Design an enzyme around this catalytic site. Sequence first.
Site, mmCIF file in Angstrom:
data_model
loop_
_atom_site.group_PDB
_atom_site.id
_atom_site.type_symbol
_atom_site.label_atom_id
_atom_site.label_comp_id
_atom_site.label_asym_id
_atom_site.label_seq_id
_atom_site.Cartn_x
_atom_site.Cartn_y
_atom_site.Cartn_z
ATOM 1 N N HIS A 25 0.790 -1.216 0.000
ATOM 2 C CA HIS A 25 0.000 0.000 0.000
ATOM 3 C C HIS A 25 0.841 1.295 0.000
ATOM 4 C CE1 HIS A 25 0.706 0.701 4.180
ATOM 5 N NE2 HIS A 25 -0.380 1.414 4.405
ATOM 6 N N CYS B 296 3.894 5.984 5.867
ATOM 7 C CA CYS B 296 3.953 4.757 6.666
ATOM 8 C C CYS B 296 5.366 4.233 6.402
ATOM 9 C CB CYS B 296 2.918 3.742 6.164
ATOM 10 S SG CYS B 296 2.667 2.275 7.218
ATOM 11 N N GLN C 12 -7.786 -2.721 9.231
ATOM 12 C CA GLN C 12 -9.064 -2.010 9.284
ATOM 13 C C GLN C 12 -10.011 -2.511 8.196
ATOM 14 O OE1 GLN C 12 -9.088 2.362 10.304
ATOM 15 N NE2 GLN C 12 -6.844 2.098 10.325
ATOM 16 N N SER D 49 -6.688 5.704 9.191
ATOM 17 C CA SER D 49 -5.269 6.055 9.084
ATOM 18 C C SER D 49 -5.039 7.146 8.024
ATOM 19 C CB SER D 49 -4.435 4.841 8.712
ATOM 20 O OG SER D 49 -4.229 4.005 9.814
ATOM 21 N N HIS E 16 -5.668 5.173 1.105
ATOM 22 C CA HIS E 16 -4.728 4.139 0.651
ATOM 23 C C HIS E 16 -4.951 3.840 -0.832
ATOM 24 C CE1 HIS E 16 -4.203 2.546 4.903
ATOM 25 N NE2 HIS E 16 -5.361 3.180 4.999
#
EC number: 5.2.1.8
Lengths: 6, 146
Positions: free
Chosen positions: B42, B96, B114, B137, B140
């Site tokens: 991702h 990330c 998630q 978060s 994505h």
Amino acid sequence: QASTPR
Amino acid sequence: KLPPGWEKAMSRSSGRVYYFNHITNASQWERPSEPARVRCSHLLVKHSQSRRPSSWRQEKITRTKEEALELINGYIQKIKSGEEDFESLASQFSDCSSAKARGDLGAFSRGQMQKPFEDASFALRTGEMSGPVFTDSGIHIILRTE
């Protein structure tokens, strides 16, 4: 590998 | 019939039929044609509404969710055009530390990530890429590798 998602 | 989450739509600009997946946010011209675990990479773009608005890229993330979506949309365009590849943009731009592994998260089963991320990942075929997928978060792009 750093807390919040893998 | 169509695989899980696919519907037929009409292009607003050209009137030609296309296909949209409401689980993965993928869209494509071509008619589209479960495992215990999948492997995904991702590219996450975080924003001011992220549950933790911070990454290795910058200590305080200030971009709006709208700005985050524009960036995601731009990366998807570059990946689909072949101007850039997924791994390269993930390494450079994902908010990330999995960016350092070209975005690779490794393999996971249901119950671990998630729900929007999980549902998109399990509904992608091997080699397929999501559209923008929203979680707490941030936003994505998800590439299913296994």
